[PDB]
């Protein structure tokens, strides 16, 4: 009955109150994980709607389990995910920084400053921040194992795994080092596909190790298969070793007595032919992604070959990388170079009440399995997340060997540099420029607040210290609340992580400042 | 100040529908009360004067019986402790066949006296250890109480006399006739080999003429009619086929492919000639009866009629196997003629009507065979069902007698002697287990007490007389049912005897159930939800 120029379910709101609501929502998101930053962080228990429980202090892991309604909160969560995917660390820092810059921008928006002016000042500040960060960086020789281990330690010193720091650092460094690869002049690390982490609850955490090979949750197809082979010649397949129908419609028509027996005998002979083709290469282990018929098992066992079936494709690729094999679909085309020599041992041992297949003496493997053994499943999941952070940090350092001081030292150094820059602006954008520069102090401030020490006196002391000449590495000790030189404490983090954090924080602030109207309720119109 | 909050800890974490009963009074005493209630429920159906109960299950079926195991099965007991006692009773029923009500009564008495001992101050462990000591003592004493043995099992008279007591608790009025029937049926079975198979006794219920017309048949009876025109033979030569009485077909897919008119015109004639040749080949062996487990084709039936072959079609595979055992045939898998050794032989196979039921009878003139059938007559379905239960009890008693031939006096003689000797022993042993041992002995009084209550006389007088008579040294004395005043008589003379194995297993299972119920201290019940099956 009503004329309804727009749909009845369309809620529209605009003006200063929209900007205030957006900035408040961003501040609330930042406040969610404010206390999860620093070496003295506290974990949080998250109740998954599916019944699971997540106990972690990672920024992205926490922000991933929140269902929000305000679109600004959705933007903040997407920022967290972007930071986690791009570099792997600094997820809490980017959220905190975005909240702080949005707050200091709201301060100006309360006055009569147009948001575009604030955005322009923010972009100028971001350029100067990048320049200063690149300036105060230091080179790192990646051939030094101790330096890489120290970098990884500073990466995971704020996580629950920091208690077993040496073990975790060595695991991450070894995995990243031996997943490195180069073909046709293209270099890669590829932690996502290779370097899998398999967690088996039970045992002790110190028993965790990185294998010179891979381990899969599989057992031999037949009891008489050998469960321990010294130097296997592994052969990997995709095709089934069964007798299956073709793609076409191939009905038969039987009129003679012996045609049924002939058909069955030809099925058996086809299986025998396939197994003979495989045997021709003299392998020791046969792994396939699909089924293996029982007759095929008998024919393989006649030749003393261990067979494993129904192995996932990702695991098969990992095995191919580890033992230097090639996956072949048609056994009749099995070249010699497709046989995997290099696996220095194959052993199907039993852990707990399950059978696990170990290929753990590969000579120069290009893939690995990180075997985690811990108290429970949630502890192991948190340990896996921490190990992922460590491996991502190691890869970032290997790609870009630059380092910057940590513990809020880089933030204060950049803030002082931009504050000195702003003394010559003489424009109207000098105020937002200075404000966003000083918004970087939220990281040392949060570190001090989590440490428990007095915030105001320590920030004043640090700011005074950074006003001197050679003080770019002076930061705050995270677990004692004391100013310290960070070339003495030994806390550093990759330059790429810091650059990504600042870029993403400023870009989020700009994106949310560009908005002054919200329209909601309309249908998707699919 | 108007509400009591749930205590912090486990009380709050419990789910909505769950219940947690913990402690002595809240768990042990409630379990004991539930078990006592179950025993009181089934008490009145104990002994020859036990009264039948009409039980209607959730499927509206009506049960009229005094067999304790059947009553408990048809009742749907919900209390877990009473469920445990019912499990004990059913295990006794499966292991022996008779003595379920004794198990239930003894377990109820034991748990009642256990509650009394817990209230007087004894701990649960002390009660349990006293009960176990007394159970061991009773099992040691029991062989000494054996009065007389079976000493013969091929004799019709002795078997009937022995089985009388088992099937006089049920169907008290007319037990001699049922004893004779079951004795004949059991003696027909049970060859020179010591093994006796309970399933070899078959029971057929045909309505109409009261249970006094029931008879024993040395063979099998099937409530159905013959397929063919022939209805009776006198020198049967049954040939049993487990295959359908039709031309065998392929297993993948049969397709008749016709490419010329001649094939089309000759196909049906050739098929009919083949079937005729097969049936003629079967008949040429002298087989004048053909029993098939599968369906009967029309042309096959016509050719069987032409050659004077009686056709019986048995639906049940168990029925086919039982018929093969009865006649001595072999279930052939093809329609091939049977060789000499696979030919079943029966004295006579005929179609007859009993009451208004058409039945086929595989009768043997010899007083022997592998399977014997008890054709039960009656005027109500429930009456024949109860008679069938009595028959099962008698057959199980015969099986137990084959396993062990020792018998102990019934009518409370064995229970009272056991109680007397266990009480005498319990005074000797010092310590806190003497109370439990004495209570275990006293629990045996629940059997003669139940018998006296059901017979309608004062139980205390009967128990006192039993103690006196046993004090002068007669251990074969039990209460006299055939009297309207408290009286006792020698049970060995009267032939009121029950199997030693029955008493042994019943005591063992009842003690185990009572002890296991006592062991439970805390109960955590989930929300009932559903679960019809």
């Amino acid at each position: 009955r009503p004329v309804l120029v727009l749909s009845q379910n369309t809620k529209r709101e605009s003006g200063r109150k929209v900007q205030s609501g957006n900035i408040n929502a961003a501040k609330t998101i930042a406040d969610i994980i404010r206390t999860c930053l620093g070496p003295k962080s506290m974990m949080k228990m998250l109740l998954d709607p599916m019944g699971g429980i997540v106990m972690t202090n990672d920024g992205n892991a926490i922000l991933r389990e929140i269902q929000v309604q305000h679109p600004a909160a959705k933007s903040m969560i997407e920022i967290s995910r972007t930071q986690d995917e791009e570099v792997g660390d600094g997820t809490t820092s980017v959220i905190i920084l975005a909240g702080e810059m949005l707050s200091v921008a709201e301060h100006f928006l309360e006055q009569q400053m147009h948001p575009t002016v604030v955005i322009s000042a923010y972009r100028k500040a971001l350029d100067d921040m990048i320049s200063t960060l690149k300036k105060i960086s230091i080179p790192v020789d990646i051939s030094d194992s101790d330096m890489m281990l120290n970098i990884i330690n500073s990466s995971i010193t704020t996580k629950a795994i920091s208690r077993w720091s040496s073990l975790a650092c060595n695991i991450a460094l070894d995995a990243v080092k031996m997943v490195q690869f180069e073909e046709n002049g293209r270099k890669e690390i590829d932690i996502k596909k290779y370097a899998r982490v398999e967690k088996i609850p039970g045992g002790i955490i110190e028993d965790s190790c990185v294998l010179r090979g891979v381990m899969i949750n599989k057992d031999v197809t037949h009891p008489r298969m050998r469960r321990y082979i010294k130097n296997p010649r592994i052969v990997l397949l995709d095709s089934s070793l069964e007798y299956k129908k073709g793609e076409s419609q191939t009905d038969i028509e039987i009129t003679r007595e012996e045609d049924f027996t002939r058909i069955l005998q030809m099925e058996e002979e086809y299986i025998q032919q396939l197994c003979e083709d495989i045997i021709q290469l003299k392998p020791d282990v046969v792994i396939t992604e699909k089924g293996i018929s029982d007759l095929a098992q008998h024919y393989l066992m006649r030749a003393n070959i261990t067979a494993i079936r129904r192995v996932r494709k990702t695991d098969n690729n990992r095995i191919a990388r580890a033992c230097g094999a090639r996956i072949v679909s048609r056994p009749e085309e099995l070249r010699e170079d497709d046989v995997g020599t290099g696996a220095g041992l194959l052993e199907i041992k039993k852990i707990g009440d399950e059978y696990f297949t170990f290929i753990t003496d590969c000579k120069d493997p290009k893939a690995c399995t990180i075997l985690l053994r811990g108290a429970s499943k949630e502890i192991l999941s948190e340990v896996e997340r921490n190990l992922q952070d460590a491996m991502q940090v190691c890869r970032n350092v290997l790609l870009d060997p630059q380092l910057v001081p940590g513990g809020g030292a880089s933030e204060m150094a950049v803030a002082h540099a931009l504050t000195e820059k702003s003394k010559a602006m003489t424009g109207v954008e000098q105020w937002p420029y200075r404000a966003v520069a000083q918004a970087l102090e939220v990281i040392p401030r949060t570190l001090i607040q989590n440490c428990g020490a007095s915030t105001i006196r320590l920030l004043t002391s640090l700011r005074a210290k950074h006003t001197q000449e050679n003080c770019e590495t002076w930061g705050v000790n995270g677990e004692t609340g004391t100013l310290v030189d960070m070339k003495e404490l030994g806390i550093w983090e990759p330059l790429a992580v810091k650059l990504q954090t600042y870029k993403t924080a400023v870009e989020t602030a700009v994106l949310l400042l560009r908005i002054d109207d919200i329209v909601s309720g309309h249908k998707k119109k699919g | 100040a108007l509400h009591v909050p749930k205590a912090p800890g486990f009380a709050q974490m419990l789910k909505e529908g769950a219940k947690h009963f913990s402690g002595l009074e809240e768990a042990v005493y409630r379990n004991i009360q539930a078990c006592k209630e179950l025993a009181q429920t089934t008490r009145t159906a104990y002994g020859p004067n036990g009264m039948n109960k009409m039980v209607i299950n959730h499927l509206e079926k009506l049960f009229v019986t005094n067999d304790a195991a059947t009553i408990l099965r048809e009742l749907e007991v919900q209390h877990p402790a009473a469920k445990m006692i019912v499990m004990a009773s059913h295990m006794q029923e499966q292991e022996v066949g008779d003595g379920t009500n004794f198990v239930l009564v003894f377990a109820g008495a034991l748990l009642e006296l256990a509650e009394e001992l817990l209230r007087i101050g004894l701990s649960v462990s002390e009660v349990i250890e006293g009960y176990e000591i007394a159970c061991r003592k009773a099992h040691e004493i029991l062989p000494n109480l054996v009065c007389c043995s079976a000493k013969n099992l091929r004799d019709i008279d002795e078997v009937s006399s022995l089985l009388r007591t088992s099937i006089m608790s049920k169907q008290y009025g007319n037990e001699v006739f049922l004893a004779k029937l079951i004795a004949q049926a059991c003696v027909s079975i049970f060859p020179d080999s010591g093994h006796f198979n309970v399933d070899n006794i078959r029971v057929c219920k045909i309505l109409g003429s009261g249970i006094s017309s029931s008879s024993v048949l040395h063979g099998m009876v099937f409530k159905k009619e013959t397929e063919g025109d022939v209805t009776s033979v006198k020198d049967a030569k049954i040939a049993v086929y487990s295959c359908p009485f039709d031309g065998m077909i392929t297993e993948t897919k049969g397709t008749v492919l016709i490419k010329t008119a001649e094939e089309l015109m000759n196909f049906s004639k050739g098929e009919e000639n083949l079937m005729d040749a097969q049936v003629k080949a079967i008949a040429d062996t002298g087989a004048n009866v053909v029993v098939t487990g599968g369906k009967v084709a029309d042309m096959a039936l016509h050719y069987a009629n032409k050659y004077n072959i009686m056709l019986v079609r048995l639906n049940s595979k168990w029925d086919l196997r039982r018929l093969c055992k009865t006649v001595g045939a072999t279930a052939l898998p093809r329609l091939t003629p049977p060789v000499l050794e696979e030919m079943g032989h029966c004295d006579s196979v005929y179609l007859s009507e009993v009451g208004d039921t058409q039945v086929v009878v595989f009768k043997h003139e010899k007083e022997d065979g592998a399977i014997s059938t008890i054709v039960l007559r009656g005027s109500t379905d429930n009456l024949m069902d109860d008679i069938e239960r009595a028959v099962d009890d008698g057959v199980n008693t015969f099986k137990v007698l084959t396993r062990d031939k020792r018998l102990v006096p019934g009518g409370g003689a064995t229970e009272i002697e056991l109680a007397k000797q266990i009480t005498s022993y319990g005074e000797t042993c010092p310590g806190l287990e003497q109370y439990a041992i004495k209570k275990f002995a006293e629990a045996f009084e629940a059997i003669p007490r139940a018998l006296a209550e059901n017979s309608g006389v004062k139980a205390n007088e009967v128990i006192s007389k039993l103690y006196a008579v046993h004090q002068e040294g007669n251990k074969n004395v039990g209460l006299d049912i055939e009297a309207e005043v408290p009286a006792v008589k020698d049970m060995l003379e009267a032939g009121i005897l029950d199997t030693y194995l029955g008493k042994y297993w019943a005591i063992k299972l009842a003690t185990n159930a009572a002890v296991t119920v006592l062991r439970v201290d805390q109960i955590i019940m989930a929300k009932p939800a559903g679960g019809p099956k």
């Binding site: 998954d48 709607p49 599916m50 019944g51 991933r64 995910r81 | 939800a529």
Partner: protein, 159 residues
């Protein structure tokens, strides 16, 4: 013991990692006419699954996980008070996985907490549905590639 569904755990861990950009939430229907014209729209081949509620949380999470891992299907939920059913339905017939495809009923399960249990997970319900043949039978892009496909003027080199 292949009857024990060893793959159930493996599928559970596969479904644990739903997607990258969160796993969304089940759409709630707040109008009877909304329910009607939601069934009316979409093509016939598109499968729509409906839940009626007031053991519901676990199955709701199961639908969330399935819709995250089965983008083709259109899992949705509605309150029993929105439709306004009878006393018996609003009392003892709440959990009912209602399945629609093309406007005709295909799955009319009711009181699913009995035949599906109460502690069942996403894989349990997924197998229960797939054995019925009711659930229809892929790399992850960066974020997106396509904006619009309207002009076929792409590339040419006429002399």
């Amino acid at each position: 013991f292949l009857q024990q569904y060893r793959k159930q755990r493996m599928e559970e861990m596969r479904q644990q990692l739903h997607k990258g950009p969160q796993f969304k939430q089940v759409f709630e229907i707040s109008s009877g006419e909304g329910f009607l014209d939601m069934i009316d729209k979409e093509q016939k081949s598109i499968v729509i699954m409906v839940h009626i509620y007031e053991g519901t949380e676990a199955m709701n999470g199961c639908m969330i996980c399935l819709a995250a891992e089965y983008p083709a299907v259109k899992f949705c939920k509605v309150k029993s008070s929105v439709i306004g059913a009878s006393s018996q339905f609003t009392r003892n017939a709440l959990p009912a996985l209602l399945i629609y495809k093309g406007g005709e009923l295909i799955g009319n399960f009711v009181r699913v907490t009995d035949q599906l249990g109460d502690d069942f997970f996403a894989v349990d319900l997924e197998a229960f549905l797939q054995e019925f043949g009711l659930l229809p039978e892929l790399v992850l892009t960066s974020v997106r590639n396509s904006a619009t496909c309207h002009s076929e003027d792409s590339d040419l080199e006429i002399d």
